[PDB]
């Protein structure tokens, strides 16, 4: 990772969420709503970054698009969470600091 | 809220 966020790609990826929870940042960087996104989610992985039980992570649609229309991407940002190999969510709420924290602690429950 | 960009 870089200060807990790690990049992952169509080579990385099946391996990184095999096990554990993720939290998982599908985006485009020319999209103003994944762009101006981005400053807190490297917020949300740095508070996370010496955490194993959940991991923050982050794909570029514009480098690994047949990933994010596998995992049925259709805009961005998509955040999902994965466990254990499974996308279970998706994210749809408020993109502050503060209530993706709690969704992360709903989450790990 | 869940505003986005169309893929």
């Given at each position: 990772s870089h200060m807990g966020l790690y990049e992952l790609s169509a080579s990385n990826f099946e391996l990184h969420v095999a096990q554990g929870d993720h939290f998982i940042k599908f985006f485009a960087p020319w999209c103003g709503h994944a762009k101006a996104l981005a400053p807190t989610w490297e917020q949300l992985a740095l508070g996370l970054?010496?955490?194993?039980?959940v991991k923050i992570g982050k794909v570029d649609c514009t480098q690994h698009y047949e990933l994010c229309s596998g995992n049925?991407?259709?805009?961005?940002?998509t955040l999902l969470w994965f466990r254990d190999g499974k996308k279970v969510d998706q994210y749809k709420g408020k993109r502050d600091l503060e209530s993706l924290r709690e969704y992360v602690e709903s989450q790990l429950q | 809220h869940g505003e986005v960009c169309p893929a």
């Open positions: 970054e010496h955490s194993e039980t049925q991407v259709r805009g961005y940002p | -």
